[PDB]
């Protein structure tokens, strides 16, 4: 019945993940213990739930989310926090030594041990789930627990289970701002891995978010913590559809049918469109046009792809709140109308539309207005290809010297893993200029 | 007699479905627990064409809501005149199509239907003489043009003789709510002109601009677009459900408004309809205007670009024969190019003594013309600029689909486009 | 039957529209909420003629108020008796014409008038026999010419044998109240007389003469302007909507007002119009009702008759006179204005009696008047035009809305063979 | 739905602004909160603000107006004033570091960082307007940021929004009190842009309004906020027929057709008649016959252009309040007799005239009686010839010794853009002699 199994790999991942069941757990009405206070005197909100939380038959609802670290702070942090008492301990897995920035670490040495456990624990999810949905994944593909576990992860995933969608929300490196220096490396080997074994990945790079935040928000200093609750936005407006009743209907099943035109093309990005400071939400009308005029912003991208070099090849607009189809018809048809947004000459209908009543909630300390309506689009462009690029470049800097490969190769990674992942996302930008080229 | 089975096919489907059942119970004066609260006998005299009388005296929509999303049980449920409907009637699968037409069709659609078969069956044999069924049903979706075009490829195997009509909306290239749109529609006509009889075409654009123009609705909900279709979907099959001066039914309308056994794709549209404000005198020759009104017609495609091959009126309330007669030959007058050259008078009428709730005087039209291949040219166009390149197949190929589905798709489509364009030209 | 239908086109023609519409509902008995509330049954014997009968026995004007302001609808709206005119027929743009015949004619107002035809279509095909259509604009403005004439072109071509009458506001040198109204008004002029079949010119300045002098009003307003205007409007098709001793109707008063087909410009002017301090001294009869018509001062054009020589004239008394009486009167003027009647077509009067007064009115009289004296108006929009033209001042905005210089000068070259053919038709002797 | 998007450009367009809008919510009713209070139990001013203030739907009515100053003070004055909460945050942009009295820092360095925000803004505002029937736009041609990025503006609108008119109302500096030094070399090089950009625009010189000040309301000590009330008046009466209900309705896309007779010579002034201190409103009638002559006065004209030495190319005549057509008609005809008034031969028929029921508001604190009519007169004179001249004079004075030029070159303006802007002025001032002319 809708459901839906989380798997929060790596410390980005995990930190991510406190933000969207936070968010999930103030939709619901779970309280922190994992008890839902009987009100309104009827189950009016019964059934809401069972996409993300699982009743334990005694009125203790478990959130559906698996969250992996091979570092034990992380977790430990969930443990010591208000939700302690919501995860199932067995469900937060922790390892004793971290990655410490390699894959390789991640993919042979110390991933293999946690993985098998970490299987269990999703097979015990999935007997539970009774017409599961889709897999939800979040990882750091900077960082190696989130590249390295989390590609094995999705291997092993795609045998054993199989069909079952993998909507993979990954936080690639933004090309200005990186965090650690041998992140190309790790990238690269994460997203051929990944290239292969997830439906759809949705593609966010801190340093846009970070801008979002100054712009939007009016941060003088955004945080990850203010970073994280705009990412759980975006992912409660994705899989609403199931949780809350809609007037058009969506389905994680559905966008990997609407937004992956080749197999391999299966990268996206994302734009939650009405993000405004309570102090500027009292001037502004935010009618449907303007919040999908909004959503189509070069800016308002959570990766840092500008748009307006590629071209839209799919649009999965997501709306939520006080939303009429009629006016949502409008607001489509004049940016099919509009020049700046260019849509490739093979997909003649390049947009999916999802209307939801339910509005989105407003967390109290969290940096947003409660506003009556909202869209999430998740868009495949051919800009995609341009942070492609930039990590090819940044990488093919490296490699050249053999730059920090005597701790990849000392971890298990044999050097000709490092060509052929770069060889595949050089096919990969291939691709992507090819289905960019007009028709014949 | 003359009863007529329901099928309301995807999530389309079961809303246009669930509005029009609320239209016809009050009608027929049913209140949403199933019990007659009716002040007129003639209410109950022909109940039978659309209900199956239950043990308590409580009357049952011959409705089969097929879906493959368990969801959309928990929206005709949830509305007014839900509890209507028998829930062993109600037949929903687990995963859903993915607006794929391949999923629908070929795998997790080939999996249901034979549940929903034995549910048809079950439904047309319990009635003493079938009319036929009314499938309603999307060619936008996968799972309304998927299992609702392998279900009427089905029910036509078992039961040739009867009338197979199929409401259906197509996707206008305005609302595009969907990428896949093109795909699921080409497949979809291939199948229903081969294995329906009638099928009047809807389009959401024309419903929007009825909405926007001809009402003056300030929010125009997919409710209010379902409460005109219903409309229409009560007056195509009237004088099955009440007496008339000059009865019709199904059978009657397809015999008059399909010239050969491939142009049966028709374009409906309610007369009355007047915004609240400018509520207009109500006669005959008005409404006769309004439903000829190209703004009027439930299709993108504005029949002045077209030539009616043939039209068929349904008149309701208590009207002069005469005044409708000379009405219906006026317009034939007027029009001289907007009615092809042989088949002279083009125009069928029919009366109903009975209008609808709260009017003097209605109509439906019904109108089988030549610019109903401007909506299927749309589709066609789009299509094309899809499968040039391949995009989006690699879905319906991995369910078992080949290519040579999706060329001969094409090819049946374009003949169809062919055939009608044939007759508009022809001059004898 | 015999109905018509009524375009009220541009601010001034809605404005004239609603006092008219107002003025014929009195008459008629017609209360602003569409119900029939008068006393006598003559009241809606012919009610057909400019109402039609909507469902609840509500009574629908047969009126299309179009515009390119949509300001105008909630002016028409706020009006007494605004309830009356049926939503539909409202048809209204957004940017206006900006005075400017070409926005009006060419750009905007062409894309407005597919819309308006649609409704003019509907209306004139629910009369069994339409008499014609009475069109209210003013030939100044960018909307009431621009759009009105373009309309006036359309219906022409649809319905060539059904009447076209216009009542048209001409600009008046002493207001000119817009600056480019001379080429408003000859682009216009141009237009109407090859597609008008009687044009009635009004001008603001004799209005306001009438209601400085022959009335004695304070403040005239554009509503006692406007009321003025509607009172003549009312006497022009009476003899339709009520019995007479002699019957009348528009093709009459045409075949009888139009010697030549280009000579369809007429003088209107409404008689019983009396000074409210001045009604005592006043005795109504026929005679003196007959002086007040023929008196230069009561007609509502610039151009007195004294100058030009009438070609004919045409009255609608009402009332019950005699009709030998009014006979008596209509010889007695004409061997009066010797020189003031052209020589060939004599006995140039006709006269038409209707029974049913207008409101509170024992008589009234209504005179339609094809003078040479309408030219002089003419010229004033000739002479003033030519100046702009010289030189091609405010040209480049009607040259912008893509009207072309040659335009100008076949508007001019017609409007001066007009000028010329009246200066004849009084100059000839025969 | 007679929308009109305000553009306030330098000090004196943002200080014009202040004074407008306190005027305009006074008008319409609208509290420095930007909630009219619902009285008299019916909408009976509802819609009226339309022109001017958007409704957000949540009874909030936000100013249709970006304030746009390369200066960071004035705004922040507007930002901590009584109408901070009705403006919004991002329509008042900011910048760093002012121009500094240079059209070349305005034009090319600064201005081109900030025009591109403040475009955005106009596009999110024109979205929201449906049928916008022009742009009011207030800079300071003396000053930087009002030439430099005001013209900037001008030329970007141009082409982005085409038909949509562009009413500008300058305040060129007066000849005798001027307030900078290098004011010719801005104004010059600021007239060259406006020229070709800007539709129909409204001189007014300071000097003069002052004078206006000092003769009408017997002011001994004027300032600047009692000089832009009187601005706003005029603004107020010119876009007053869109707001209020009048006989014989005007619009801003009518006087671009009635006033400027050939595209280079929209050039015009204005006169507001019964400017009047209560003091002196005892012993007056003020009949419209009166207002009308004192409209024509050569010293109530608000630009210093004497327009006894020109003739009267198209005049536009504005009533409020009590005002008869008929009264009016016997006023502009007896200005039409006078000797002092002269039109040019190529239009006899001068004088557009708009009368409007709605009477003139009185601002408290404000030097203005209240009057029952009014009327605010714009002119094309060939008078206005005599200004251009004396800016050509007192530039022709500098550039003979490169007087300051070093300035404007060292900020991305070639010399040879002054000797262009001078030679396109001199075809100017041709021009408007050759228009003046006698028919041949
Ligand atoms: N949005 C967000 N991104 C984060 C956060 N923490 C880390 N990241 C991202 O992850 C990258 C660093 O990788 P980590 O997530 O720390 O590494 P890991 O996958 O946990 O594996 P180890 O490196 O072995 O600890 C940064 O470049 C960020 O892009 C966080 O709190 N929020
Ligand atoms: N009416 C009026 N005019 C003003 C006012 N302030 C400045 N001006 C005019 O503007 C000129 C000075 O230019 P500013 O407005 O200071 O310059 P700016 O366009 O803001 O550009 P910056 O120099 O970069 O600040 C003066 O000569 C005046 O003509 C004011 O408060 N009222
Ligand atoms: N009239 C109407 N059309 C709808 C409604 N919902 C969806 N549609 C249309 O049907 C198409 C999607 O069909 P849907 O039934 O949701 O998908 P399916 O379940 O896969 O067939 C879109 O092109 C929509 O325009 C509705 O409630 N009313
Ligand atoms: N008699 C009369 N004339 C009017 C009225 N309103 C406007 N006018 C005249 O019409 C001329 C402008 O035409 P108008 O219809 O207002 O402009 P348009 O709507 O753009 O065509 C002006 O010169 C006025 O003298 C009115 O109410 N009565
Ligand atoms: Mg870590
Ligand atoms: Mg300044």
Redesign the interface.
């Given at each position: 019945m809708r459901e839906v199994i989380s798997i929060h790999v790596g410390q980005g991942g995990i930190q991510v993940g406190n933000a969207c069941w936070e968010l999930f757990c103030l939709e619901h009405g779970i309280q922190p213990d994992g008890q839902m206070p009987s009100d309104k005197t009827i189950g009016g909100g019964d059934d809401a739930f069972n996409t993300f939380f699982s009743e334990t038959g005694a009125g203790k609802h478990v959130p559906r989310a698996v969250f992996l670290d091979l570092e034990p702070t992380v977790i430990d942090e969930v443990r010591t926090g208000t939700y302690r008492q919501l995860f199932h301990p067995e469900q937060l897995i922790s390892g004793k030594e971290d990655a410490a920035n390699n894959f390789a670490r991640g993919h042979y040495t110390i991933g293999k041990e946690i993985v098998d456990l970490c299987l269990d624990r999703i097979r015990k999810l999935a007997d539970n789930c009774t017409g599961l949905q889709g897999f939800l994944v979040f990882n750091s593909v900077g960082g190696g627990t989130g590249s390295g576990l989390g590609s094995l992860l999705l291997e092993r995933l795609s045998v054993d289970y199989g069909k079952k969608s993998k909507l993979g929300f990954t936080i690639y490196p933004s090309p200005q701002v990186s965090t650690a220096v041998v992140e190309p490396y790790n990238s690269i080997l994460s997203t051929h891995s990944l290239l292969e074994h997830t439906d759809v990945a949705v593609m966010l790079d801190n340093e846009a978010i970070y801008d979002i935040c100054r712009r939007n928000l009016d941060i003088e200093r955004p945080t990850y913590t203010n970073l994280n609750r705009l990412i759980a936005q975006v992912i409660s407006s994705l899989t609403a559809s199931l949780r809350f009743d809609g007037a058009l209907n969506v389905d994680i099943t559905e966008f990997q049918t609407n937004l992956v035109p080749y197999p391999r093309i299966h990268f996206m990005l994302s734009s939650y469109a009405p993000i405004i400071s309570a102090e500027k939400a009292y001037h502004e009308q935010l009618s449907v046009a303007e919040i999908t005029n909004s959503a189509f912003e070069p800016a308002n991208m959570m990766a840092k792809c500008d748009p307006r070099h590629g071209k839209y090849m799919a649009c999965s607009m997501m709306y939520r709140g006080d939303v009429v189809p009629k006016d949502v018809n409008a607001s489509i048809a004049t940016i099919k109308t509009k020049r700046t947004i260019q849509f490739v000459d093979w997909c003649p209908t390049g947009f999916k539309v999802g209307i939801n009543y339910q509005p989105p909630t407003v967390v109290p300390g969290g940096d947003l207005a409660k506003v009556m309506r909202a869209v999430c689009m998740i868009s495949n462009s051919t800009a995609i290809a341009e942070v492609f690029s930039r990590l090819d470049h940044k990488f093919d800097l490296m490699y050249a010297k053999r730059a920090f490969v005597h701790w990849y190769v000392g971890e298990g990674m044999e050097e000709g893993e490092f060509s052929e992942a770069r060889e595949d996302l050089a096919a990969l930008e291939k691709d992507y200029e090819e289905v960019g080229i007009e028709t014949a | 007699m003359r009863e007529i089975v329901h099928i309301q096919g995807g999530?389309c489907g079961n809303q246009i479905g669930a509005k029009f059942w609320e239209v016809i119970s009050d009608e027929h004066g049913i209140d949403p627990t199933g019990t007659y609260h009716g002040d007129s006998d003639l209410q109950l005299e022909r109940i039978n064409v659309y209900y199956n009388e239950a043990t308590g005296g409580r009357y049952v929509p011959r409705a089969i809501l097929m879906d493959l999303?368990?969801?959309?049980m928990?929206?005709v449920r949830?509305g007014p005149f839900g509890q209507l409907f028998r829930p062993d009637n109600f037949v929903f699968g687990?995963?859903?199509a993915?607006?794929?037409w391949a999923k629908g069709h070929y795998t997790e659609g080939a999996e249901l239907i034979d549940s929903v078969l034995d549910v048809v069956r079950k439904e047309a044999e319990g009635c003493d003489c079938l009319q036929g069924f009314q499938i309603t049903h999307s060619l936008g979706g996968?799972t309304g043009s998927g299992m609702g075009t392998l279900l009427i490829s089905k029910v036509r195997e078992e039961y040739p003789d009867r009338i197979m009509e199929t409401f259906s909306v197509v996707?206008s290239?305005?609302?595009?709510?969907?990428?896949?749109?093109?795909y699921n529609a080409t497949l979809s006509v291939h199948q229903l002109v081969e294995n329906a009889d009638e099928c009047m075409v809807i389009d959401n654009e024309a419903l929007?601009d009825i909405?926007?123009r001809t009402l003056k609705l300030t929010?125009?909900?997919?409710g209010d677009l379902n409460h005109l279709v219903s409309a229409a979907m009560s007056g195509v099959t009237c004088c099955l459900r009440f007496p008339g001066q000059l009865n019709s039914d199904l059978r009657k309308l397809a015999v008059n408004l399909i010239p050969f056994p491939r142009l049966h794709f028709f374009m409906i549209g309610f007369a009355p309809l007047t915004?609240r404000?400018?509520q207009?005198?109500?006669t005959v020759?008005?409404l006769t205007?309004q439903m000829f009104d190209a703004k009027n017609m439930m299709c993108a495609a504005d029949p002045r670009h077209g030539r009616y091959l043939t039209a068929s009126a349904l008149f309701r309330g208590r009207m002069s024969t005469k005044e409708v007669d000379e009405q219906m030959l006026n317009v034939q007058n007027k029009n001289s190019s907007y009615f092809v050259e042989w088949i002279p008078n083009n125009i069928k009428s029919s009366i109903c003594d009975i209008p609808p709730k709260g009017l003097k005087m209605a109509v439906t039209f019904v109108g089988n013309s030549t610019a109903i291949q401007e909506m299927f040219k749309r589709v066609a166009?789009?299509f094309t600029?899809?499968f040039?390149?391949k995009?989006?197949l690699?879905?319906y190929t991995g369910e078992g689909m080949d290519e040579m589905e999706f060329t001969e798709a094409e090819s049946n489509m374009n003949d169809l486009v062919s055939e009608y364009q044939q007759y508009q030209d022809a001059t004898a």
């Open positions: - | 999530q999303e368990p969801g959309t928990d929206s949830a687990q995963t859903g993915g607006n794929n996968g996707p290239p305005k609302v595009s709510d969907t990428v896949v749109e093109p929007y909405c926007f929010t125009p909900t997919y915004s404000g400018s207009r005198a109500l020759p008005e205007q166009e789009q600029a899809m040039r390149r995009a989006f690699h879905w």
